[PDB]
Amino acid sequence: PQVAEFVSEMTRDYGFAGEQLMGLFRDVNRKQSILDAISRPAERVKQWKEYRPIFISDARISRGVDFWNKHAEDLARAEKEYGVPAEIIVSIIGVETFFGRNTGSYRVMDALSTLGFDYPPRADFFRKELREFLLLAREQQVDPLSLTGSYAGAMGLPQFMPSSFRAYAVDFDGDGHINIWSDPTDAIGSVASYFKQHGWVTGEPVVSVAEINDESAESAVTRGVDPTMSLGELRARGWRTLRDDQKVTAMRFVGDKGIEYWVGLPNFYVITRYNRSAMYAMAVYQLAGEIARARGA
Numbered sequence: 001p002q003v004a005e006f007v008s009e010m011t012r013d014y015g016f017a018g019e020q021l022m023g024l025f026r027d028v029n030r031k032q033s034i035l036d037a038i039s040r041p042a043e044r045v046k047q048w049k050e051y052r053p054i055f056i057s058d059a060r061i062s063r064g065v066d067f068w069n070k071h072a073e074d075l076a077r078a079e080k081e082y083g084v085p086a087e088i089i090v091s092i093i094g095v096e097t098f099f100g101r102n103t104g105s106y107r108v109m110d111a112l113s114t115l116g117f118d119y120p121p122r123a124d125f126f127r128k129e130l131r132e133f134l135l136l137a138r139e140q141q142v143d144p145l146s147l148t149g150s151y152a153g154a155m156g157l158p159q160f161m162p163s164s165f166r167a168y169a170v171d172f173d174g175d176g177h178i179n180i181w182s183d184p185t186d187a188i189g190s191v192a193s194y195f196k197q198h199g200w201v202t203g204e205p206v207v208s209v210a211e212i213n214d215e216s217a218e219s220a221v222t223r224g225v226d227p228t229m230s231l232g233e234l235r236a237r238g239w240r241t242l243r244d245d246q247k248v249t250a251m252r253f254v255g256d257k258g259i260e261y262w263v264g265l266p267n268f269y270v271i272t273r274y275n276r277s278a279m280y281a282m283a284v285y286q287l288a289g290e291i292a293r294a295r296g297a
């Protein structure tokens with residue numbers, strides 16, 4: 001019914017053959033397990049002390065260094081062309097999929113159709129991503145049922161949503177295909193492109209350890225990841241850490257040895273564009289640091 005509607009829209013607006021599409025959707029399955037996963041209540045709070053070691057592990061650093069050893073030239077080329085550190089690219093791929101170990105259990109078509117048609121709270125968002133998916137599959141001339149992703153439709157080594165693939169992904173080995181699923185070279189350039197296009201500033205720092213004077217300084221801790229003040233204003237609130245005329249966020253983490261205070265600079269905010277969590281972005285940054293250290297970068 002609404003499927004027929006979506007199909008009419010793809011036919012009228014996007015130039016798709018109605019019959020070809022209906023044949024496609026006959027093969028698509030509704031997955032109850034996806035509706036359950038997206039439905040889940042909030043998980044128990046993890047302190048930084050619990051969250052960090054999920055990502056900063058012997059195995060994850062080892063596999064990251066291995067990934068870099070294997071893709072060293074591609075990584076140097078992406079750093080040069082996009083002005084984003086190699087270690088940040090490697091870290092994103094390590095955090096998202098463990099360098100291609102865990103790239104999602106579903107056909108993208110099943111996930112996006114299940115959510116687009118059968119999950120009211122976010123049906124519009126996923127219906128849009130379904131349309132973007134159909135467009136990218138046509139552009140790349142690949143069978144739409146051949147591509148995998150997470151239960152929420154995120155695809156390949158870097159877990160790009162379909163809309164991000166179309167906006168930001170690149171053919172980084174010049175073969176005329178964009179394959180972020182099994183071509184690490186395209187994945188590497190695609191992550192670098194995403195970061196440059198979300199405002200990464202080449203050569204600027206990302207975070208700084210801080211200490212505070214007084215309990216009153218805790219009032220400046222940022223709610224969420226959007227900055228509300230300059231670093232100079234944050235220093236006036238009693239934080240000690242950099243240029244003062246930049247917008248920063250202020251973090252208070254419960255770490256392995258006690259409370260840690262951190263200042264997030266604009267490049268930190270760029271990382272949170274990938275996933276809007278201060279802990280996520282700190283794990284990406286700290287994992288990048290450890291991998292770069294092991295590489296001698």
Ligand SMILES: [Ca+2]
Pocket residue numbers: 170171172173174175176177178179183186
């Ligand atoms: Ca390619």
